[PDB]
């Protein structure tokens, strides 16, 4: 019943950023500074459809394991699942231009969400854990392959881009560690959290990696 | 019933743009000729299979919201859904090169067509015109982008790309504002026509803007 | 009921080969060395996600045309339908780097697989060869561009990449000749074989491709 409240909350924050985005973005821009800005931009715009989608929560309500619907958690995986890889891009592009990196990146990205859904979606008891797992090594291989990112310094301009993703990669690890415990705990995990929490923790980390990091990239540009 | 007609109609005159343009298409091109050949003979290759899966309409026969079948509506989403992308990549393509515009014009795009399947899909009776509306609001910023296009010229070679483009932007424009409409008046809007309408209007503009826009760059090139 | 012992050897196989080819893979590589490893590296991944949702089976125990599963046959169409796009996409960069020729090349990689896809789970009892039919001509597309990939040799380097290629394209045709024929006789075709076979056949073809692609890559590289 209540997660309509974080979920109307979420919808109005993440329409704002996408909105504000569009107008602060816009400007001076047509080369690198219009990716970012494009590419920073597009994930709020989804973000936002998806938080409409989550709040009204369309198709129909049938539990694929407990007694909570499933039209939300759909959602949420849309969301994560075009929105990660559209950030880490982003993230990457900043740095790293290598194709092999940032395709393989991306790879591991997708099967992290993708996988984490497999997961989310078993109708099995115990094993949805075991997806879990692999989601979890699949997320530590980003993290991993971030730590490279900033180790590799090479081509790099002003002092501005480096900070920027000194704070980004701090971010961004925090909120994407956060994502997994609370899957684990509450939602889809053991259900240690009642439900409402699912939905508050979550949207926090999801309106807060998205907004926040296209402020730092707000920052940045 | 009638249905099967004009969707045969489309196979049988789709499948044709598609050979059709694989033997015209083909001849001297590597580069730019051929991407421009691939990407407008991919098009119709999509809308042809997805017009025989129309046509016999595969999956099962479940109401959303009314008495009509949905394979049908499916089909269209999945056909918009892939074909827009490639022609506004191409129409792009042929005057703007900037990854930003481009690539935060196809993000536009992937929201205008998912978002209007969203709406189509929705089961609740009145918010389907919600996410039409957003669809809308897609649509127009893809249009406006389309007008910065055409205004920013910049980089051009010969005259007869900027004619190519010219009759290309009307055509779409045309063509995709009769999209919502029609959508709006029958199919998943109010229900204002009686059913074989749809079909007809919405594959009148399939088939025009495809394989006319199809023609119109087999004119260009 | 036998299909596990065969989706499991396959789980093991893929995996092992997806580590190992981590681990292989790695090294000295930055651009095309890296590119070449992560596109071949993130295929076995998949594969064996893949193959643990085969072996595991999720989601429901529906029919779509017959008295067997359908959690098995639909992994596999994905398993494929990432698999094929990038395996094509190795290739393909190893010689010819044709925008249009690529893109054309993984859009009809796109339906092959897709339209497979769709024939695989169209529920009409005598139609699915349509559909069969339809993969086919994509399949003899893809091959017979692969016939000029060869044919075309333009820009190359040591001699290795021309051997490699050589084996690479025979192994290709062979494998994914098999696919198709293997399809029609058991698993959603006819059901000349039982069900054990289709398992079999198809994990046979599929480790191997994958896996003996991934290694005439690591002796090319
Ligand atoms: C399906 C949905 C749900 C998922 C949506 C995800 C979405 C696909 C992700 C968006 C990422 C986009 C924005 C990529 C941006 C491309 C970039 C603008 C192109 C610039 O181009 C220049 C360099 C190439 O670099 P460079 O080193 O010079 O090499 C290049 C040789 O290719 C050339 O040709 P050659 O070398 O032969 O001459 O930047 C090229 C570097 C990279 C940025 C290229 C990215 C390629 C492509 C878009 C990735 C698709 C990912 C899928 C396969 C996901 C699979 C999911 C799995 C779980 C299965
Ligand atoms: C390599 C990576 C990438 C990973 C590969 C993963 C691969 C993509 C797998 C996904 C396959 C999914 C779609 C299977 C879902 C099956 C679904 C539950 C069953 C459909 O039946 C209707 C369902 C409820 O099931 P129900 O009928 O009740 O099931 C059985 C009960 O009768 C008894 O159950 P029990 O025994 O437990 O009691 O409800 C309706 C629910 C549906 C609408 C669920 C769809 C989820 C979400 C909306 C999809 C997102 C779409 C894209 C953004 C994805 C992009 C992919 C790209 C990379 C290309
Ligand atoms: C679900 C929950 C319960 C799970 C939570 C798990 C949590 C995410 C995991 C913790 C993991 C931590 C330990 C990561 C550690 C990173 C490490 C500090 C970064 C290294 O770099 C250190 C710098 C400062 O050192 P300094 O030497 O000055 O560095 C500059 C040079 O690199 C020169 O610069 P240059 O090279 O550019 O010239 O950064 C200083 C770093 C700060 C920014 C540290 C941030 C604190 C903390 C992690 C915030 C917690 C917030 C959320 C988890 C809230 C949860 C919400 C809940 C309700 C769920
Ligand atoms: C999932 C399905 C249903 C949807 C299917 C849609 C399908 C993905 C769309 C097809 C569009 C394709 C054909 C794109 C063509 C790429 C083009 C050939 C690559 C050429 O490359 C050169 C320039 C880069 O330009 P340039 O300015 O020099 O910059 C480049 C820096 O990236 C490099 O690296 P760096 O700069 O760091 O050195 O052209 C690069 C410009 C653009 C053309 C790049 C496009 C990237 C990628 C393919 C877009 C994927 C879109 C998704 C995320 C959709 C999301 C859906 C939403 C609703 C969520
Ligand atoms: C940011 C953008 C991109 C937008 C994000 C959007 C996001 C992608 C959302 C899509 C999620 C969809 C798939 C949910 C569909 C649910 C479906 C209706 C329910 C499944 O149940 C079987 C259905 C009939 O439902 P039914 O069971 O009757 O439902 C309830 C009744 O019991 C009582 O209803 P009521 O209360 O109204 O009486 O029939 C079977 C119908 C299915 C086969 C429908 C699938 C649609 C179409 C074929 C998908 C196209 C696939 C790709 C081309 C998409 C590319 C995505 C990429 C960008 C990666
Ligand atoms: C569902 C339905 C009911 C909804 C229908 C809605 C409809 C789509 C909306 C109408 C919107 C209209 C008003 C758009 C206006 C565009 C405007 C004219 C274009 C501006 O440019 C004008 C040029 C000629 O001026 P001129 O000065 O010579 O221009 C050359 C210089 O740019 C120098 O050139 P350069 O810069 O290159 O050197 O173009 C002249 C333009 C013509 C090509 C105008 C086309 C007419 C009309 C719109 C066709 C209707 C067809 C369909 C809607 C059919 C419906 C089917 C139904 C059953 C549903
Ligand atoms: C949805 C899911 C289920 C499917 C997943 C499939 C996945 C999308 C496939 C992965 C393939 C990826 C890895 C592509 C790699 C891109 C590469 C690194 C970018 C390098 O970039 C440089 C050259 C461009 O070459 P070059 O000749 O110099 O031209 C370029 C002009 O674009 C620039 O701009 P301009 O020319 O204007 O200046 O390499 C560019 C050449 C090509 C490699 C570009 C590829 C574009 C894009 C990624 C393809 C998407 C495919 C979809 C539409 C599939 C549809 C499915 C159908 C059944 C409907
Ligand atoms: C141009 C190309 C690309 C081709 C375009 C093709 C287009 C993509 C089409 C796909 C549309 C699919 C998803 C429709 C599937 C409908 C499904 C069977 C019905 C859903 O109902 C639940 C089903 C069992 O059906 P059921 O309810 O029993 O049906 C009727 C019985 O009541 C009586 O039947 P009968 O009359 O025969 O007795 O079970 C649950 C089964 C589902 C979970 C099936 C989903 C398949 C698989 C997991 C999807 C992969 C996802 C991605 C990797 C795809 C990437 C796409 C990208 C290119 C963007
Ligand atoms: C489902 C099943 C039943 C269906 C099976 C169908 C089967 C796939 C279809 C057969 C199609 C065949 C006939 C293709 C023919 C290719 C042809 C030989 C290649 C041409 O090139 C010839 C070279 C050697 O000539 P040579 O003159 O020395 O060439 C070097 C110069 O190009 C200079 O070099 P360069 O230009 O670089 O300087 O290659 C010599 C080529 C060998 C590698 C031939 C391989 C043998 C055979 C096809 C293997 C069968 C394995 C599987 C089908 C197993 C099935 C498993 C079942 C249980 C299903
Ligand atoms: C705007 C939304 C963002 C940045 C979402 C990110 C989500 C994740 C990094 C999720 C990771 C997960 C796992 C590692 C395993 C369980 C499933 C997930 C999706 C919670
Ligand atoms: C070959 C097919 C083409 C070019 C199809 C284009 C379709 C559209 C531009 C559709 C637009 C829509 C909206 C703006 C809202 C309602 C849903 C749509 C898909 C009708
Ligand atoms: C690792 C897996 C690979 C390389 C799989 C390849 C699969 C194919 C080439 C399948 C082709 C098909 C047809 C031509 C028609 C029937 C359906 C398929 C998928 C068996």
Sequence with gaps: RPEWIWLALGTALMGLGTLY??????????????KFYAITTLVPAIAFTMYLSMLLGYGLTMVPFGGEQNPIYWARYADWLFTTPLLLLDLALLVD??????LALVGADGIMIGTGLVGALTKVYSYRFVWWAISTAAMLYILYVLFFGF????????????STFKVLRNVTVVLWSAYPVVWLIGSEGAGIVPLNIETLLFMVLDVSAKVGFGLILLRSR
């Design 151 to 162: 180790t590799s310094k090479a081509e790099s301009m002003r002092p501005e881009v480096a």
């Design 21 to 34: 985005f569009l107008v602060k973005g816009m400007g001076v821009s047509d080369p690198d500074a219009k």
């Design 97 to 102: 231009a290598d194709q092999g990196t940032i």
